[PDB]
């Protein structure tokens, strides 16, 4: 006589297996396939009967679903971080959840402090602000490997809030990160910074640590843009344009690239997400 909460367990892990098979991932030596939304609904089903288990959490979002609720879900249960995978002997080489900023990156998942900058990513995306903050403030990592990405949340919602001085704190100039990613994307907001500031010297500068090995494509498109209006402050017109019209060849949804190359007079420092 199984009792509920044992076959709610048991039906929870065999969803969780079903949907990292649906994923593409080969478990327990079983064929993978690839349906997305059956990978979805396992996973949810598995949240559904073990809330617990922060791995099915982390499954939908590996399938997509990175809204509050599932951030949440995943935060609450953050005790079993982890033990699914581990039970099964999935590993981060198959299995990589990440959310996006809704700017630049895509946040990698691998510990308990980037789940907690994920979801705090997340809130910041929702405007709630204060929550994304508290739960940075209570993160605080020992280690510098996890702290980059705090310092690099921080900083998307200080640019969220055109907070420019506190975006220019979280990103300086001549700093090494281990993550490049983070590097890049801070230096496009730090460009966006300096350029609404003013001081376009200092935004043309630092708009080159965004650019370079074109990394972060979306960063590059902004730091190449925010250069295009530098140039085009000073009069450099013909270089200007070559800049905006790269922008807009990398990537023709890249709007303002087209209103300056159709307008000489537009002179727009992007500041909204979009």
């Given at each position: 006589?199984?009792?509920?909460?044992?076959?709610?367990?048991?039906?929870?892990?065999?969803?969780?297996?079903?949907?990292?098979?649906?994923?593409?991932?080969?478990?327990?030596?079983?064929?993978?396939?690839?349906?997305?939304?059956?990978?979805?609904?396992?996973?949810?089903?598995?949240?559904?009967?073990?809330?617990?288990?922060?791995?099915?959490?982390?499954?939908?979002?590996?399938?997509?679903?990175?809204?509050?609720?599932?951030?949440?879900?995943?935060?609450?249960?953050?005790?079993?971080?982890?033990?699914?995978?581990?039970?099964?002997?999935?590993?981060?080489?198959?299995?990589?959840?990440?959310?996006?900023?809704?700017?630049?990156?895509?946040?990698?998942?691998?510990?308990?402090?980037?789940?907690?900058?994920?979801?705090?990513?997340?809130?910041?995306?929702?405007?709630?602000?204060?929550?994304?903050?508290e739960l940075l403030d209570a993160t605080d990592?020992?280690?510098?490997?996890?702290?980059?990405?705090?310092?690099?949340?921080?900083?998307?919602?200080?640019?969220?809030?055109?907070?420019?001085?506190?975006?220019?704190?979280?990103?300086?100039?001549?700093t090494q990160w281990r993550h490049?990613?983070?590097?890049?994307?801070?230096?496009?907001?730090?460009?966006?910074?300096?350029?609404?500031?003013?001081?376009?010297?200092?935004?043309?500068?630092?708009?080159?640590?965004?650019?370079?090995?074109?990394?972060?494509?979306?960063?590059?498109?902004?730091?190449?843009?925010?250069?295009?209006?530098?140039?085009?402050?000073?009069?450099?017109?013909?270089?200007?344009?070559?800049?905006?019209?790269?922008?807009?060849?990398?990537?023709?949804?890249?709007?303002?690239?087209?209103?300056?190359?159709?307008?000489?007079?537009?002179?727009?420092?992007?500041?909204?997400?979009?």
């Amino acid at each position: 006589h199984m009792t509920r909460p044992q076959a709610a367990a048991e039906d929870a892990r065999n969803a969780m297996v079903a949907g990292l098979l649906a994923s593409g991932i080969s478990v327990n030596g079983l064929q993978p396939s690839h349906n997305p939304q059956v990978a979805a609904q396992m996973f949810t089903t598995a949240t559904r009967l073990d809330p617990k288990m922060c791995d099915a959490w982390l499954a939908r979002l590996l399938a997509g679903d990175q809204s509050i609720e599932v951030l949440a879900g995943a935060w609450a249960a953050v005790r079993t971080f982890g033990w699914e995978t581990r039970r099964l002997g999935v590993t981060d080489l198959q299995f990589r959840p990440e959310v996006s900023d809704g700017l630049f990156l895509r946040l990698a998942i691998t510990s308990v402090d980037s789940l907690a900058c994920a979801y705090a990513a997340v809130l910041a995306e929702a405007k709630r602000y204060q929550e994304a903050a508290e739960l940075l403030d209570a993160t605080d990592p020992r280690h510098p490997f996890d702290a980059e990405l705090v310092s690099y949340v921080r900083g998307v919602l200080y640019f969220r809030t055109k907070r420019w001085p506190d975006v220019l704190a979280q990103f300086p100039e001549a700093t090494q990160w281990r993550h490049p990613e983070l590097k890049a994307a801070g230096a496009a907001m730090a460009t966006t910074a300096l350029a609404s500031l003013g001081v376009f010297e200092e935004a043309f500068r630092r708009a080159q640590e965004a650019i370079e090995g074109d990394r972060v494509p979306g960063a590059a498109n902004i730091a190449l843009y925010t250069q295009g209006m530098c140039l085009r402050h000073v009069g450099r017109e013909e270089e200007a344009v070559e800049l905006l019209r790269r922008v807009y060849s990398r990537d023709a949804k890249f709007t303002p690239a087209r209103e300056a190359l159709d307008n000489p007079n537009f002179r727009l420092i992007l500041t909204d997400p979009e």
